[PDB]
């Protein structure tokens, strides 16, 4: 099946892309990103989400890996004074 947008005609089966009438050569990764955005018009994705959805889950460390490792440190070192700064990151107090 094909996916159409204003400018794009994308073939999911063959990885072929037509842009305003012209056939476009994309890398595999470029293609997956283009197709992901083109299949989800009007929706904002964070860079973290796009990394996950396009490059795949669990192939290399991400910002989630960082959060998971902090939680694991907290369990193995009870009372470890790592402060969470909601929506930024972490700080060790003492």
Residues of this chain that interact with its own copies (CB under 8 A) are 5-8, 17, 19-20, 24-26, 29-30, 33-34, 37-38, 40-51, 54-55, 59-63, 65-67, 69-70, 72-73, 76-77, 79-82, 85, 88-94
Let me know if 88 is exposed, middle or buried by CB neighbors in 10 A (0-12, 13-18, 19+). Answer: exposed
* Structure tokens given for 35: 């197709």
Nearer to its own copies, 13 or 57 (CB): 57
A 10 A CB-CB count for 10 gives 22
Triad 68, 72, 78: Cα angle to 5°: 140
Min dist. Cβ of residue 11 to its own copies (A): 15
Nearer to its own copies, 1 or 57 (CB): 57
Min dist. Cβ of residue 1 to its own copies (A): 18
């Amino acid at each position: 099946d094909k996916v159409m947008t204003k400018d794009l005609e994308i073939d999911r089966a063959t990885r072929e892309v037509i842009f305003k009438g012209d056939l476009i050569t994309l890398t595999r990764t470029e293609f997956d990103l283009l197709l992901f955005l083109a299949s989800n018009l009007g929706r904002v994705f964070t860079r973290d989400e796009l990394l996950d959805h396009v490059w795949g889950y669990n192939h290399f460390p991400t910002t989630r890996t960082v959060d998971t490792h902090v939680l694991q440190l907290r369990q193995k070192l009870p009372g470890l004074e790592i402060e969470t700064l909601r929506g930024v990151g972490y700080k060790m107090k003492a």
